[PDB]
Design a binder for this molecule. Sequence first.
Ligand SMILES: [Ca+2]
Ligand SMILES: [Ca+2]
Length: 173
Amino acid sequence: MANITVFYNEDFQGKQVDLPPGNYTRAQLAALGIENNTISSVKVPPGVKAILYQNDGFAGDQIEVVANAEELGPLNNNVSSIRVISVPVQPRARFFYKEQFDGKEVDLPPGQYTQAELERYGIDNNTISSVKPQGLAVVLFKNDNFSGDTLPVNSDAPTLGAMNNNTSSIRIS
Ligand SMILES: [Ca+2]
Ligand SMILES: [Ca+2]
């Protein structure tokens, strides 16, 4: 019942398409219609972990995700091959764009992120705000390699766009 959902245009914009898990490429896609510069944004719920592949035929710099990716990454200039495999259930956290549990919503599973993936994997170098732990507590860092001042969000906070200065790294515990 799971299935990844891509977006034609960037910024989580542009008609989306639901593709079933499993491994496939330009061949299967040829059957559909989309291919190449199209898988701009992505949205993949838990229960499964996806792996993207720039060049078709499963080649080129690959990627790995299990949540949504408003801004995939630099290699987003070309996409066609992918690989998805079911995965155990894992809680996560939910962040909102505007300060008011609103605006572009993004979420990430438990783990660690830096000033590169995090931003280009859920939001960006900043503009976070209101957070809502969907299952695990969230901790923010104000420096690369998660090393410096921090703000451990041990609970609900539908408003935080006034403290986290430049979120360089995070740790969903
Ligand atoms: Ca963009
Ligand atoms: Ca806020």
